[PDB]
CSV table of C-alpha atoms in Angstrom, one decimal:
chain,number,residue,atom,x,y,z
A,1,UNK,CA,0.0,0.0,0.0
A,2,UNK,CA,1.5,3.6,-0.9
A,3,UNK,CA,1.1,6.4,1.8
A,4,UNK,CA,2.4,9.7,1.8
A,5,UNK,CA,4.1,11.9,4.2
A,6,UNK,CA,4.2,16.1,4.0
A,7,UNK,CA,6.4,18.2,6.6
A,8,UNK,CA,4.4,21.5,8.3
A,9,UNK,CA,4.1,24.8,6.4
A,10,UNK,CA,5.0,26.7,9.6
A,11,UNK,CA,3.1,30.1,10.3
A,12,UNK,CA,5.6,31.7,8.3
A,13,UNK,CA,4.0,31.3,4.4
A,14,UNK,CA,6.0,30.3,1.1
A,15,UNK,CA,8.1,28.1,0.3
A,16,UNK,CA,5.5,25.3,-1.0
A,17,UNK,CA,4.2,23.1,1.5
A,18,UNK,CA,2.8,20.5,-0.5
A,19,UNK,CA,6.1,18.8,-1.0
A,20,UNK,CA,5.4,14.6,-0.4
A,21,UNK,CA,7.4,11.6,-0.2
A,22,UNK,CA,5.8,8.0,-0.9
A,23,UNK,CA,6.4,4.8,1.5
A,24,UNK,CA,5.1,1.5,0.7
A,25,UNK,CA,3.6,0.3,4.0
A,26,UNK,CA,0.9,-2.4,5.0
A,27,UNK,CA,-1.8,-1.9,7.3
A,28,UNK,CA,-0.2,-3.9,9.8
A,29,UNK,CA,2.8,-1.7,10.0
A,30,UNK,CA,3.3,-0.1,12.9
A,31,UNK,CA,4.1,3.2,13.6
A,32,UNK,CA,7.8,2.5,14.7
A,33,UNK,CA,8.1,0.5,11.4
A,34,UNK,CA,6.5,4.4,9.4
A,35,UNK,CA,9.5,6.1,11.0
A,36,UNK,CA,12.2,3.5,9.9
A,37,UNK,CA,10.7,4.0,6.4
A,38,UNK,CA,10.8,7.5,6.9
A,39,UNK,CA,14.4,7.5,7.9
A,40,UNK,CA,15.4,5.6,4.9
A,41,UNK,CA,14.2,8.3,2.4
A,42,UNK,CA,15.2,11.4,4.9
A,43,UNK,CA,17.9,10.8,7.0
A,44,UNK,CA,15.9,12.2,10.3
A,45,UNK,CA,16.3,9.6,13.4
A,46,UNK,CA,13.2,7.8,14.5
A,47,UNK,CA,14.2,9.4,17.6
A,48,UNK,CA,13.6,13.1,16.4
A,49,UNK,CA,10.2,12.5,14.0
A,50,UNK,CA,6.8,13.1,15.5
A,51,UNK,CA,3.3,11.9,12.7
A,52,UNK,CA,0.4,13.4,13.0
A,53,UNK,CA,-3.1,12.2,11.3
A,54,UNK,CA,-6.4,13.5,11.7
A,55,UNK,CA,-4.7,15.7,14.0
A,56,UNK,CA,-3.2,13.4,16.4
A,57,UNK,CA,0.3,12.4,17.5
A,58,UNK,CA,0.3,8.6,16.8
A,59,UNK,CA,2.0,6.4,18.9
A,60,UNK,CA,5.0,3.8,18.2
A,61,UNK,CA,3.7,0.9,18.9
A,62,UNK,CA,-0.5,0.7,17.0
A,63,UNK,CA,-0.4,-0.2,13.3
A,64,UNK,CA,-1.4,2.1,10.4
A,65,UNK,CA,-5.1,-0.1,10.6
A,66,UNK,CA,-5.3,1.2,14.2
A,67,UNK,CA,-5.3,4.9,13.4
A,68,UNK,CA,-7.3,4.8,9.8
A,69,UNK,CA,-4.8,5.1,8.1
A,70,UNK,CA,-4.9,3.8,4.2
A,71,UNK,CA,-4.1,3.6,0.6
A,72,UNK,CA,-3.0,7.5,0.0
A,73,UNK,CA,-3.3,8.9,3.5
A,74,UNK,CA,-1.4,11.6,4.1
A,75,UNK,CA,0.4,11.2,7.4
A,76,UNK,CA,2.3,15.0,8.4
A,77,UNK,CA,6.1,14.9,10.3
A,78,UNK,CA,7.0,17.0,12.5
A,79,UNK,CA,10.1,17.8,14.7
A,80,UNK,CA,11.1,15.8,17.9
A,81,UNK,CA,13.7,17.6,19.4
C-alpha cells in the first residue's frame, strides 16, 4: 500500500508546502516500522520525528489499521527535538 508523508508549512507562508514523499507500507505496519521508512528516504532519526493524522500524535507501537490510516493517506512529520 502507498502512503504519503508532508512536513508543516510553519506560520511563516512560502516556500510550497505540498512537497510529499511516498512509503510502501501495509496496514499492519506499525508506527515504529512508518519512521524507519521515513528515515530511509530522509535521513531524520526515528528518535527526532513526531506523525500526526487526523490531527493526532500517533504512537509507536498501534499499526497504520489502528489509526485509519490507508491507501493515500497523508500522514504529516513533524520535529522531535
Amino acid at each position: 500500500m502507498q502512503i504519503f508523508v508532508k512536513t508543516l508549512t510553519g506560520g511563516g507562508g512560502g516556500g510550497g508546502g505540498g512537497k510529499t514523499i511516498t512509503l510502501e507500507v501495509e496496514p499492519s505496519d506499525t508506527i515504529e516500522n512508518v519512521k524507519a521508512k521515513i528515515q530511509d528516504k530522509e535521513g531524520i532519526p526515528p528518535d527526532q520525528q513526531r506523525l500526526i493524522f487526523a490531527g493526532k500524535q500517533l504512537e509507536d507501537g498501534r499499526t497504520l489499521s489502528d489509526y485509519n490510516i490507508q491507501k493515500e493517506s497523508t500522514l504529516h512529520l513533524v520535529l522531535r527535538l
